[PDB]
Design a protein around this nucleic acid. Structure first.
Lengths: 225, 206, 38, 96, 127, 98
RNA sequence: GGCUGUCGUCAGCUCGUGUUGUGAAAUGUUGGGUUAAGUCCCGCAACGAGCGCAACCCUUAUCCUUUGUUGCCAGCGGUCC
């Protein structure tokens, strides 16, 4: 079996994990299976519901903002968030004045972690102009669009609550590379090096461990039949 | 009399309070008071607004107030008419920055309040109690629901001998706390007497 | 009426914005010369 | 409850404030061991309705003075209704 | 080592600690004879003890504080009997036979509106 | 050490309102000695049901005032300044005295 | 009108359909056991259903998980005990 070690951490987002001792056919197999798991099945947190002040629907324009409500909703999807203890958390963006909204600006409460202080949400282009939107975050498995979310709602009077396409996937890109190695007493052994890029809401060591656990639960039923 | 309030009896489970907030003996005294003034008034200028309930949240010197209504648009105003007025009327009435969020009533035929305020209004329109009481209320059974018990007080029609009426569909086991029912009253001061009415809508079980 | 009220408020805002840029700027410029001279 | 009655109380409040509530305090000093000037004791009679003891509460909703409870300021049945209608925060039947 | 035994009855709280040896008994810095001794019938506390040869057997360090004599004495009996069961989990039958292993669920009663004392209904000689 | 108190009318709110602190108000900076329940202040009332007469009527009500302590046992700045960022709860008295 | 007491916490009160009599009406719901109870089990020209009774609510009677301030002190220690 392989021993997981040697974590070459490049940045907060990017990383390069390696698994040195692997059999002749164990380089491609696990790596390709993990690639299929990591991209498809990856638990995470992202924006779902948003309610903006002085805005009844999307496809309108707010006073004192150059970026439209439809354009803001798209920027909200790109914003990275990671929740430790809480399942769902509602943040509030209290800010005003001439200039760009850095990225944080929200009141820091509970277990909500923020990894983006530069990520642009919107630009304020007037003195008295003000914005105060309550943003909701939800936990899930995969990609859930806005079209699916209006079916089994049952009474959704909040018209201000403009819906967004949810994206519960931490990985941005994945790439494995198998290279030959000569360990302490060996003939022909592959070295699986898994290069992984993330949004920054979950660790690479934590993501790869959770991905392998999902495959074990699936393989558990296949033994006894 | 010999019946427990089918709503208060359940105020603990399966039934939320139409006014949830904290307060101490000090302000509590005048607190529930203002809530009455504001709530009583919100109906005066919004009777035909077809308003159901009227919750009242209270964090700290800023009550929320939610006017549930089958007719939201009319309770909205000319893109600011209604809202502004009310939202402002809550001025000295509570002496605090009081907001106001409207809630849309889904299927106004299953909500007690409405089904009650309606039948009573029809009565005031010179209409046979039996007809409306039965049919004009029977609808609550077509849009779904399982059981609806109506009740019209006495003095119905030309008569000095007040009489109560029955008429009920499905099942209304008001003897079950885990039953959850939509009960509400409604008067109708007509040419003579005050023909009352009570709506008992059994919206599913647990 | 709500639309025409909003259209009237926006019309008063747009034309007043012209009178505040030009007419405030012109009024302060004429007044500044009068203070220097007098 | 009457309309006239439900009015007097209202005033009995005002006067019992603009004066006694803060002014009686003054004579309360002399008319007490604070070393009891007769004049001060006599001056005590300037008003009448101006007294914190001349108030019988009365239902804050209707007016019925019988069945008051500083908590809700209401009178029996009023508390009864408001309670069942949930109009009163956190308050349901009591059983134990 | 030691063996704990809660035990209680009628708003009471018993806390007896059975140690191997030392037939001495103390309840809240007091003697089982100086706190209870010479009472109504506080011979119940040391009842389960002697029930199986004590004194020169083990020790009893109690800490009760709930309910009056009768009850406060009943709680201990429950804690003790419960306790011994620890030192030997094969003597339950014996203690149960007497009825110590079980607690006196029979608590006080709550008064009731209309009545005058939860049960004592007001008289009406003329009806 | 700053002490915090939460007294609501039920767990439906006193719960989330408290867990919030332990979660948010307590990350690494704040110490937090622990969330305690504390005795509940029970205040019931008896009201005559029938209007006039029928003494044998009466109805009993009650308002349970649920409370919680917890309190943070670490007066820092980075974590002791992330609590104000929480003022929701339509009914959760939070006496933040020291 | 709204609200309350009372028979009475009594086990009672009915409906649909079917069948029976010219009809009011009956049957069901009576009978045999049984239960706190129109509770249940057989029977039976009735087959099913609703309001009830029961059960959901609280509270008290054991233990478990969890948190440990103003509550606790089993051990160890220091005692202005």
């Amino acid at each position: 079996k392989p021993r997981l070690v040697d974590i070459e951490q490049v940045s907060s987002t990017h990383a390069k994990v390696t698994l040195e001792p692997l059999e002749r056919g164990f380089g491609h197999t696990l790596g390709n299976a993990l690639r299929r798991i990591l991209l498809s099945s990856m638990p995470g947190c992202a924006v779902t519901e948003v309610e903006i002040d002085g805005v009844l629907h999307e496809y309108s324009t707010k006073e004192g903002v150059q970026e439209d409500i439809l354009e803001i909703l798209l920027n909200l999807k790109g914003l990275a968030v990671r929740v430790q203890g809480k399942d769902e958390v509602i943040l509030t963006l209290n800010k005003s004045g001439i200039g760009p909204v850095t990225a944080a600006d929200i009141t820091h409460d509970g277990d909500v972690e923020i990894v983006k202080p530069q990520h642009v949400i919107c630009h304020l282009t007037d003195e008295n102009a003000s914005i105060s939107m309550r943003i909701k975050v939800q936990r899930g498995r995969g990609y859930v669009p806005a079209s699916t979310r209006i079916h089994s709602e049952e009474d959704e009077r909040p018209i201000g609550r403009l819906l967004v396409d949810a994206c519960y996937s931490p990985v941005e890109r994945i790439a494995y590379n198998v290279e030959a190695a000569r360990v302490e007493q060996r003939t022909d052994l592959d070295k699986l090096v898994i290069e992984m890029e993330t949004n920054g809401t979950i660790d690479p060591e934590e993501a790869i461990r959770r991905a392998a656990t999902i495959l074990a639960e699936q393989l558990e039923a296949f033994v006894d039949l | 009399g010999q019946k427990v309030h089918p709503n208060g009896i359940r105020l603990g489970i399966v039934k939320p309070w139409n006014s949830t907030w904290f307060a101490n003996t000090k302000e509590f005294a005048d607190n529930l008071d203002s809530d009455f003034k504001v709530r009583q008034y919100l109906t005066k200028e919004l009777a035909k607004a077809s308003v159901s309930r009227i919750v009242i949240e209270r964090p700290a010197k800023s009550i929320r107030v939610t006017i549930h209504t089958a007719r939201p648009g009319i309770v909205i105003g000319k893109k600011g008419e209604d809202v502004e007025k009310l939202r402002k009327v809550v001025a000295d009435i509570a002496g605090v920055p009081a907001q106001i969020n409207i809630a849309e009533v889904r299927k106004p035929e299953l909500d007690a309040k409405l089904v009650a305020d309606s039948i009573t209004s029809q009565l005031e329109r010179r209409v046979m109690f039996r007809r409306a009481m039965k049919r004009a209320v029977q609808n609550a059974m077509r849009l779904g629901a399982k059981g609806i018990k109506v009740e019209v007080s006495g003095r119905l029609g030309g008569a000095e001998i007040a009489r109560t009426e029955w008429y009920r569909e499905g099942r209304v086991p008001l003897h079950t706390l885990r039953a959850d029912i939509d009960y509400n009253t409604s008067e109708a001061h007509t040419t003579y007497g005050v023909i009352g009415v009570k709506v008992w809508i059994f919206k599913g079980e647990i | 009426l709500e639309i025409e009220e909003m259209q009237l408020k926006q019309a008063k805002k747009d034309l007043s914005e012209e009178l505040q840029i030009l007419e405030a700027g012109l009024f302060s410029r004429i007044r500044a010369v009068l203070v220097a001279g007098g | 409850a009457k309309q006239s009655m439900k009015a007097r109380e209202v005033k009995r409040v005002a006067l019992a404030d603009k004066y006694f509530a803060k002014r009686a305090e003054l004579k309360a000093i002399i008319s007490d061991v604070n070393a009891r000037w007769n004049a001060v004791l006599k001056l005590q009679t300037l008003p009448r309705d101006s007294s914190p003891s001349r108030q019988r509460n009365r239902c804050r909703q209707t007016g019925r003075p019988h069945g008051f409870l500083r908590k809700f300021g209401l009178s029996r049945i009023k508390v009864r209704e408001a309670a069942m209608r949930g109009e009163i925060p956190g308050l349901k039947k009591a059983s134990w | 080592n030691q063996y704990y035994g809660t035990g209680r009855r009628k708003s009471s709280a018993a806390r007896v600690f059975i140690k191997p040896g030392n037939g001495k008994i103390v309840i809240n810095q007091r003697s089982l004879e100086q706190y209870f001794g010479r009472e109504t019938a506080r011979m119940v506390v040391r009842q389960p003890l002697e029930l199986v040869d004590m004194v020169e057997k083990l020790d009893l360090y109690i800490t009760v504080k709930g309910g009056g004599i009768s009850g406060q004495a009943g709680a201990i009996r429950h804690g003790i009997t419960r306790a011994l069961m620890e030192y030997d989990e094969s003597l339950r039958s014996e203690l149960r036979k007497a009825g110590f292993v079980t607690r006196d669920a029979r608590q006080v009663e709550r008064k009731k509106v209309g009545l005058r004392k939860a049960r004592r209904r007001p008289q009406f000689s003329k009806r | 050490r700053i002490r915090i108190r939460l007294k609501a009318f039920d767990h439906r709110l006193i719960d989330q309102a408290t867990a919030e602190i332990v979660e948010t108000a307590k990350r690494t900076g704040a110490q937090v000695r622990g969330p305690i329940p504390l005795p509940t202040r029970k205040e019931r009332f008896t009201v005559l049901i029938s209007p006039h007469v029928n003494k044998d009527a009466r109805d009993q009500y009650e308002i349970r005032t649920h409370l919680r302590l917890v309190d943070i046992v670490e007066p820092t700045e980075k974590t002791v300044d992330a609590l104000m960022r929480l003022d929701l709860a339509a009914g959760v008295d939070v006496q933040i005295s020291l």
